[PDB]
From a paper:
The mitochondrial calcium uniporter (MCU) is responsible for mitochondrial calcium uptake and homeostasis. MCU consists of two conserved transmembrane helices (TMs) connected by a 9‐aa linker with a four‐residue “DIME” motif flanked by an N‐terminal domain (NTD) and C‐terminal domain located within the mitochondrial matrix 11, 12, 13. MCU is associated with many regulatory proteins such as mitochondrial calcium uptake‐1 and mitochondrial calcium uptake‐2 (MICU1 and MICU2), an MCU paralog (MCUb), and essential MCU regulator (EMRE), forming the mitochondrial calcium uniporter complex (uniplex) 3, 4, 5, 6, 7. MCU NTD appears to be essential for the regulation of mitochondrial Ca2+ uptake through interaction with regulator(s) and/or modulation of post‐translational modifications.
To elucidate the structural basis for the impaired activity of MCUS92A we determined the 3D structure of MCU NTDS92A with N‐terminus T4 lysozyme fusion at 2.75 Å resolution. Overall structures of the NTDWT and NTDS92A are similar with a RMSD of 0.60 Å. Interestingly, we found that the NTDS92A induced a conformational change in the L2‐L4 loops. In the structure of NTDWT, hydrogen bonding between S92 and D119 maintains trans‐conformation of the P91, which is located next to S92. On the contrary, NTDS92A breaks the S92‐D119 hydrogen bonding and induces conformational change to cis‐form of P91. Overall, L2 loop conformation in the NTDS92A moves away from L2 loop of NTDWT at a distance of Cα atom of 5.6 Å. Sequentially, side chain of R93 forming hydrogen bond with E118 in the NTDWT moves up to the position of S92 and makes a new hydrogen bonding with D119 in the NTDS92A. In addition, L90 interacting with hydrophobic residues, V88, L115, I122, V125 and I153, in NTDS92A moves away from L90 of NTDWT at a distance of 2.5 Å. Thus, we suggest that a conformational change in L2‐L4 loops of the NTDS92A impairs the mitochondrial Ca2+ uptake activity. In addition, the NTDS92A induced a conformational change in L2‐L4 loops and impaired mitochondrial Ca2+ uptake activity, suggesting the possibility that S92 phosphorylation induces structural change and charge distribution in L2–L4 loops resulting in the modulation of the MCU function.
Residue numbers in the entry: 1 to 163, 1075 to 1164
The structure:
């Protein structure tokens, strides 16, 4: 787990233009296009960012490239900023990623407005920061995200985020999932030919009382049919949604 997997979870993946929860036009993995309320302003901005005529639509490659630029921008924004850099340099990798997340969501300047929180973080005072961050326009606008980001600063662990990975062992695919607020990782061995998506999903549910929703989607956000055999599933990437969160899974081969 790292900054890129973390932001994938927080931000999801969309190949069409959409309104985020603040209601601004966005695409890709959390790429804000404009704060303008015009959809043409937004299509216009997209075309500039990609360097072609998209008609509001991009490819998975274009999303990852853009995402990669935005993260880079966010790190370079921290290093150029005089309030942010000291804090960033004091922090371990996991807490650094929490900060970059914040910068990525609300810019260099919004984040430097958090003078007390930042001081507390520099001073190693993890709960006092957490409590303080928890009282902010940020937390109010996007509380679920903010809680996750705050838990990362509080703890210095990846506990608020989850996981999904796919590995072969004996020629069988093995899927491991660590859920948010869970110490234990859990794994699932499937039979490629005879097992299907729905079988795997029912097992996922069976494993934890805390799961109220599970689904698989293509990267395009189209639901994969439950009856689809696991061998077909693993020919490409897919999105596994578990409660609120989405995990972009990238099987080998």
């Amino acid at each position: 787990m790292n900054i890129f997997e973390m932001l994938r979870i927080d931000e999801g993946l969309r190949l069409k233009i959409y309104k985020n929860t603040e209601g601004y036009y966005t695409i890709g993995i959390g790429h804000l296009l404009t704060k303008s309320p015009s959809l043409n302003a937004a299509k216009s901005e997209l075309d500039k960012a990609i360097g072609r005529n998209t008609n509001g639509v991009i490819t998975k490659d274009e999303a990852e490239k853009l995402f990669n630029q935005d993260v880079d921008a966010a790190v370079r924004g921290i290093l150029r900023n005089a309030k942010l850099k000291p804090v960033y340099d004091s922090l371990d990798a996991v807490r650094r990623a929490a900060l970059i997340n914040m910068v990525f969501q609300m810019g260099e300047t919004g984040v430097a407005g958090f003078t007390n929180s930042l001081r507390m973080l520099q001073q190693k005072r993890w709960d006092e920061a957490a409590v303080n961050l928890a009282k902010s326009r940020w937390y109010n606008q996007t509380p679920n995200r903010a809680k996750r980001v705050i838990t990362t600063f509080r703890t210095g662990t990846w506990d608020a985020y989850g996981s999904v990975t796919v590995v072969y062992q004996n020629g069988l695919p093995v899927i491991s999932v660590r859920l948010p607020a869970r110490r234990e990782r859990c794994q699932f061995t499937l039979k490629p030919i005879s097992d299907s998506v729905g079988v795997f999903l029912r097992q996922l549910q069976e494993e934890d009382r805390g799961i109220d929703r599970v689904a698989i989607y293509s990267p395009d956000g189209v639901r994969v049919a439950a009856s689809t055999g696991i061998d077909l599933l693993l020919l490409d990437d897919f999105k596994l949604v578990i409660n609120d969160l989405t995990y972009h899974v990238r099987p080998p081969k």
